[PDB]
Amino acid sequence: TRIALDPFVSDLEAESAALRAAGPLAAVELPGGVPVWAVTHHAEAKKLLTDPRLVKDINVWGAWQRGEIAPDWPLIGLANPGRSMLTVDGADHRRMRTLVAQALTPRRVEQMRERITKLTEELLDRLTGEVVDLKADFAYPLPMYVVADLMGIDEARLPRLGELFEKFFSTQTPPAEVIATLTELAGIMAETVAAKRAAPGDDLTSALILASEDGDHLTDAEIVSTLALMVAAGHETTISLIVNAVVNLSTHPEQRALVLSGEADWSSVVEETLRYSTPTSHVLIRFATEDVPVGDKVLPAGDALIVSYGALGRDEAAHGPTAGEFDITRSTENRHISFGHGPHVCPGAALSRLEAGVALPALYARFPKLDLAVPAAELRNKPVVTQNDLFELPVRLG
């Protein structure tokens, strides 16, 4: 009675339905036969996400310590990454989040609005033809241009960043080359940090250099790992938020009419796309330092936990009987947690909300009739078991 997640992501909708039914704590098999628990309901996910007995420290994973995880397990990169804010808990983690919060402020993000608007305008200007891949031609490049500008990365490097991003995120890149791509990316981040130390500017890298709490400040390695982690965490997720928003408005034409007519705001489209169709279906990975009761079940000490954000987005207990449907007019008692909850909560939430909040109205203001060039059912998930990404978004601009 263990739900094996399909690594080709052939029926995300059925899998999510299965996970909710088997919850709040579902027995799951990750691709390559690795057993873990998934928290698949809203209330229980929030409790676990704030429970200090669920940690990122891979030492705690009994199966890992006992040499039972194949060294070439495809997901070993996700489960065992290099040290960053991502892999720490407790006082070490609070220190990093405090310093990062001084740099990636709500105001720094809001101040990007005009630059995101200009980048969006230039991408829309280049759209030609009656039907286009909106992902490749519009959604894909926007967050790369935005994060490079945010981080103060040399504009000259943008052609190489596009090559590095494509390799990093491609389902075809072998692990050795993903590692070499990440090494070159970290080298670009190190060069950016060394330049901003000499010539401080109004950019996130300069702000991460400057951040301090009673004399304490990030080391060069922590700044580089933070910048590299923000690229890895923020690129395809933001792309998929924009993509999924256009798919949701395309398959719900009466709600498209509400937003295009100004009766519903774009923010309601973005928030409902995040609950209903999060870019991030599962987050690896947490380990229990002791037995943790989850509903009528026990999560054993040394066992692994993934958070099934995709599944729990449509939790009827959180959102009421309509949880299973896209409705941009819904009021819920419970804000979605598609950006996480507790100490590891997404520090990029305002940025991805701003990119989508600028890009969607701009797109439909240029092409108010745009719609899918294929039936929804012909759209394909990429074989990335943790992500809700499409191979392409064929659109008729109109």
Ligand code: HEM
């Ligand atoms: C729609 C877009 C995005 C979604 C759905 C998303 C979702 C998430 C979630 C759910 C987590 C927490 C995982 C967990 O603890 O269970 C997270 C962490 C993170 N996100 Fe985001 N994210 C998005 C965009 C971004 C952006 C644009 C950035 C950076 C600028 C970013 C940077 C991070 C980082 C650095 C972490 C690790 C935080 C930590 O562990 O302390 N994300 N994201």
